[PDB]
């Protein structure tokens, strides 16, 4: 289990759409203690997004089936299956959050890295919050918001408005306001100013990042249109 | 634990796209030893299709990367990952095949079901063949051919040419000839006669099953024009 070997295996697993393997590879890479490159960071991020994503997708289907059933035998099955999916989901989120606290955030030598990992921390507490019961929830929601907020402040100070990480943070942070806090108003103003400040930046883009930035801008505006129908 | 409870859990799993769970539920329903209903047969089939298919899809990507490279370190990674994927795939195929042999084929009391399960046996031996490389291959290819052939004999005798299972068998058997046995002429002949016989007997088409039948006919002809 060499660093290059594990990264190469992670890229193979990605092409094979075998995301558990991919996450396992990048988990052990992260655990070697060294600061991840841009490439590795993205591989870790993509792997766990897919690993949690599958459970989040399943959770929403099973949860909706539980809510649409009017007897006790069928509901208790949907309920028990939701709870099985929930524990898998929490195990995965806590894996990622542990990696973030122990290795990734401490070793982040640049503002880019810092913001990226703090956004990631916000995301995985937000996924725990989607699934929270209510007592633990308020504490989960505050962790998410603190992570996003610290990231938001570093991004404003240290990155241009058209930077894909800054735009991506705005998108996710706005989704957090809408879906976790239930504030359409805060979600809209966050998304709007991110879009408008990016539109205003004149030739701030570069040949590498322009495709991702303009795509996230489109996703910001899509949310604005949806949220004021 | 209860048959109906396992089937309901399988339907939940399907909606959740959690196909290993779906496959586990329907496997244990099969193991209870009673002849499966049509709904249960289809749930088993869909479940394992997706379980084995993910491995097949992964296998093809990792084979393609192995072939498209000549770096010594990178080729050895791909090969060992292909082999990991292959033993997963073989274990899935062997679970399905043992269910077919022990429970599904012996209990099938209608020609429709017998043809379905023999076709299924053909399919899963074919998936073993796709991965077979050693001297094991000829034996596996033969196993696949005999299952398909027995299914073919029964369907021809007992089922109408428009019946979706008859048509479905013709599609899969033609694919076997083309992809496993490298025999495009036999593949085209099988597909063409199945298409033509169905066209000739459009009188004997059911309102419940015509959509499936005409879709499969379209696939048979798509292969004819592709293979031409
Ligand atoms: Ca997987
Ligand atoms: Ca699964
Ligand atoms: Cl995997
Ligand atoms: Cl996966
Ligand atoms: Cl599953
Ligand atoms: Cl699955």
Curated annotation (Swiss-Prot), chain A:
Major localisation: cytoplasm
Keywords: Acetylation, Cytoplasm, Host-virus interaction, Phosphoprotein
Stored SMART domains: 14_3_3
Effect of residue 53 to R: Found in a patient with a neurodevelopmental disorder; uncertain significance
Domain of life: Eukaryota
Compartmental location: Cytoplasm; Melanosome
Listed Gene3D superfamilies: 14-3-3 domain
Modified how: The delta, brain-specific form differs from the zeta form in being phosphorylated. Phosphorylation on Ser-183 by MAPK8; promotes dissociation of BAX and translocation of BAX to mitochondria. Phosphorylated on Ser-58 by PKA and protein kinase C delta type catalytic subunit in a sphingosine-dependent fashion. Phosphorylation on Ser-58 by PKA; disrupts homodimerization and heterodimerization with YHAE and TP53.
Phosphoserine modification, residue list: 58, 183, 206, 209
Matching CDD domains: 14-3-3_beta_zeta
Site annotation Interaction with phosphoserine on interacting protein: residues: 56, 126
Any Gene Ontology biological process: negative regulation of apoptotic process
Biological role stated in the UniProt entry: Adapter protein implicated in the regulation of a large spectrum of both general and specialized signaling pathways. Binds to a large number of partners, usually by recognition of a phosphoserine or phosphothreonine motif. Binding generally results in the modulation of the activity of the binding partner. Promotes cytosolic retention and inactivation of TFEB transcription factor by binding to phosphorylated TFEB. Induces ARHGEF7 activity on RAC1 as well as lamellipodia and membrane ruffle formation. In neurons, regulates spine maturation through the modulation of ARHGEF7 activity.
Record's subunit section: Interacts with CDK16 and BSPRY. Interacts with WEE1 (C-terminal). Interacts with SAMSN1. Interacts with MLF1 (phosphorylated form); the interaction retains it in the cytoplasm. Interacts with Thr-phosphorylated ITGB2. Interacts with BCL2L11. Homodimer. Heterodimerizes with YWHAE. Homo- and heterodimerization is inhibited by phosphorylation on Ser-58. Interacts with FOXO4, NOXA1, SSH1 and ARHGEF2. Interacts with Pseudomonas aeruginosa exoS (unphosphorylated form). Interacts with BAX; the interaction occurs in the cytoplasm.
Name of the protein in question: 14-3-3 protein zeta/delta
Biological source species: Homo sapiens (Human)
